[PDB]
Motif scaffolding. Structure first.
Motif, PDB file in Angstrom:
ATOM      1  N   UNK A 195      65.925  41.115  15.962  1.00  0.00           N
ATOM      2  CA  UNK A 195      67.665  41.019  16.855  1.00  0.00           C
ATOM      3  C   UNK A 195      66.670  40.105  18.088  1.00  0.00           C
ATOM      4  N   UNK A 196      65.072  39.985  17.949  1.00  0.00           N
ATOM      5  CA  UNK A 196      64.767  39.448  19.133  1.00  0.00           C
ATOM      6  C   UNK A 196      65.086  37.670  18.636  1.00  0.00           C
ATOM      7  N   UNK A 197      65.343  36.981  20.042  1.00  0.00           N
ATOM      8  CA  UNK A 197      64.722  35.784  20.451  1.00  0.00           C
ATOM      9  C   UNK A 197      63.858  34.877  19.053  1.00  0.00           C
ATOM     10  N   UNK A 198      64.301  33.805  18.548  1.00  0.00           N
ATOM     11  CA  UNK A 198      62.965  33.693  18.108  1.00  0.00           C
ATOM     12  C   UNK A 198      62.808  31.921  18.558  1.00  0.00           C
ATOM     13  N   UNK A 199      61.742  30.771  18.767  1.00  0.00           N
ATOM     14  CA  UNK A 199      61.295  30.254  20.068  1.00  0.00           C
ATOM     15  C   UNK A 199      62.500  28.874  19.751  1.00  0.00           C
ATOM     16  N   UNK A 200      63.017  28.532  18.389  1.00  0.00           N
ATOM     17  CA  UNK A 200      64.116  27.805  18.735  1.00  0.00           C
ATOM     18  C   UNK A 200      65.144  28.248  19.241  1.00  0.00           C
ATOM     19  N   UNK A 201      65.527  29.340  19.304  1.00  0.00           N
ATOM     20  CA  UNK A 201      66.571  29.210  20.615  1.00  0.00           C
ATOM     21  C   UNK A 201      65.660  29.795  21.963  1.00  0.00           C
ATOM     22  N   UNK A 202      64.813  29.856  21.715  1.00  0.00           N
ATOM     23  CA  UNK A 202      64.680  30.163  23.466  1.00  0.00           C
ATOM     24  C   UNK A 202      64.493  28.407  23.672  1.00  0.00           C
ATOM     25  N   UNK A 203      64.457  27.631  22.680  1.00  0.00           N
ATOM     26  CA  UNK A 203      64.330  26.285  23.543  1.00  0.00           C
ATOM     27  C   UNK A 203      65.607  25.666  23.825  1.00  0.00           C
ATOM     28  N   UNK A 204      66.478  26.511  23.534  1.00  0.00           N
ATOM     29  CA  UNK A 204      68.156  26.337  23.901  1.00  0.00           C
ATOM     30  C   UNK A 204      68.455  27.415  25.510  1.00  0.00           C
ATOM     31  N   UNK A 205      67.628  28.021  25.437  1.00  0.00           N
ATOM     32  CA  UNK A 205      68.164  28.542  27.045  1.00  0.00           C
ATOM     33  C   UNK A 205      68.421  27.709  27.540  1.00  0.00           C
ATOM     34  N   UNK A 206      69.379  28.241  28.729  1.00  0.00           N
ATOM     35  CA  UNK A 206      69.497  27.781  29.921  1.00  0.00           C
ATOM     36  C   UNK A 206      68.070  27.814  30.792  1.00  0.00           C
ATOM     37  N   UNK A 207      67.888  28.838  30.874  1.00  0.00           N
ATOM     38  CA  UNK A 207      66.980  28.740  32.006  1.00  0.00           C
ATOM     39  C   UNK A 207      65.735  27.773  31.570  1.00  0.00           C
ATOM     40  N   UNK A 208      65.674  27.894  30.348  1.00  0.00           N
ATOM     41  CA  UNK A 208      64.023  27.102  29.823  1.00  0.00           C
ATOM     42  C   UNK A 208      64.604  25.617  29.853  1.00  0.00           C
ATOM     43  N   UNK A 209      65.990  24.786  29.672  1.00  0.00           N
ATOM     44  CA  UNK A 209      66.179  23.774  30.363  1.00  0.00           C
ATOM     45  C   UNK A 209      66.708  23.818  31.663  1.00  0.00           C
ATOM     46  N   UNK A 210      66.826  24.014  32.152  1.00  0.00           N
ATOM     47  CA  UNK A 210      66.844  24.165  33.682  1.00  0.00           C
ATOM     48  C   UNK A 210      66.361  23.250  34.501  1.00  0.00           C
ATOM     49  N   UNK A 211      66.290  21.905  35.063  1.00  0.00           N
ATOM     50  CA  UNK A 211      66.132  21.252  35.914  1.00  0.00           C
ATOM     51  C   UNK A 211      66.060  22.290  37.332  1.00  0.00           C
ATOM     52  N   UNK A 212      64.558  22.060  37.864  1.00  0.00           N
ATOM     53  CA  UNK A 212      63.974  22.922  39.170  1.00  0.00           C
ATOM     54  C   UNK A 212      63.832  22.350  39.876  1.00  0.00           C
TER      55      UNK A 212
END
Ligand SMILES: O=c1[nH]nc2cc(CO)c3ccc(-c4ccc[nH]4)cc3n12
Length: 268
Positions: free
Chosen positions: A251-268
């Motif tokens: 059930x754990x997130x895979x890296x392809x889906x980590x790359x879709x994560x909101x924080x992962x893609x968040x402009x800081x």
């Protein structure tokens, strides 16, 4: 290594590796710096085979987020591995205890960590000991995955195998290592990356181990993110951690889906 040490100053110890201590070597004439890992093969009967495997795996690697391997040689019972000197040091020392580091810095390092792990997994290699002590920084603070002493092949061409070895560093190991006789390689590395992210954001490891008896792990399973380290972590990266630090590796997130994560893609 007498001829070598005539021309190269072994200036100081940089740290410990899985199989030996690592020294900074600087050529007296050129001032080129290289990291020399010095392995005493008499420390374990299986050390020759183990270091041979680390060398073998190192020869497979070529990526901007993996420590470069230059070569090796044996002298007597000592194996010498010659590795990139990453002058930015260990990621560990960018983590202020109980504080962490600024979120933008954590995000950038995490992106680079993902790039390195994707690369390793793509060639069928699992590191198995991802932690800030094994993530080095070059002179431009680019992250480099270090130390393949515990690394192994989990995919032969396009055929995966399950792993069974309980290895790694306990606060970073995935719960399936303590629960399942065999398990998939990739989710274990994903989990340790989540613990690294946690440490980067809050300067604190969340638990001794993800076991049934560890109260701090039970608190996390019970969504008690109002306790440390979680209460120091913004809800956006916390949402990613909720997806990474999932007990069931299937059930754990895979890296392809980590790359879709909101924080992962968040402009800081
Ligand atoms: O440069 C390297 N190559 N391999 C290693 C392995 C380790 C052990 O984690 C290592 C540890 C530290 C440093 C460092 C500290 C300060 C500047 N640089 C470099 C290291 N290092």
């Amino acid at each position: 290594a007498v001829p070598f040490v005539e021309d190269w100053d072994l200036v100081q110890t940089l740290g410990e590796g899985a199989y030996g201590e690592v020294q900074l070597a600087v050529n007296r004439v050129t001032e080129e710096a290289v990291a020399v890992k010095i392995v005493d093969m008499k420390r374990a009967v299986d050390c020759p085979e183990n270091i041979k495997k680390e060398i073998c795996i190192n020869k497979m690697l070529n990526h901007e987020n993996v420590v470069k391997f230059y070569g090796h040689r044996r002298e007597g019972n000592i194996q010498y591995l010659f590795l990139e000197y990453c002058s930015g040091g260990e990621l560990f020392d960018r983590i202020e205890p109980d504080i962490g580091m600024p979120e933008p810095d954590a995000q950038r390092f995490f992106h680079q960590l993902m790039a390195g792990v994707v690369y390793l997994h793509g060639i069928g290699i699992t590191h198995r000991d991802i932690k800030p002590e094994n993530l080095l920084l070059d002179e431009r603070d680019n992250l480099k995955i270090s130390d393949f002493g515990l690394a192994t092949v989990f995919r032969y061409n396009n055929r995966e195998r399950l792993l069974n070895k309980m290895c790694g560093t306990l606060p970073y190991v995935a719960p399936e290592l303590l629960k399942r006789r065999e398990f998939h390689a990739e989710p274990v590395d994903v989990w340790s990356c989540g613990i690294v992210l946690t440490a980067m954001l809050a300067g604190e490891l969340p638990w001794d181990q993800p076991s049934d008896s560890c109260q701090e792990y039970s608190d996390w399973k019970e969504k008690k993110t109002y306790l440390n380290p979680w209460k120091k972590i913004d809800s956006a990266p916390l949402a990613l951690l909720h997806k990474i630090l999932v007990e069931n590796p299937s059930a754990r997130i895979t890296i392809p889906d980590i790359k879709k994560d909101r924080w992962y893609n968040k402009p800081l």
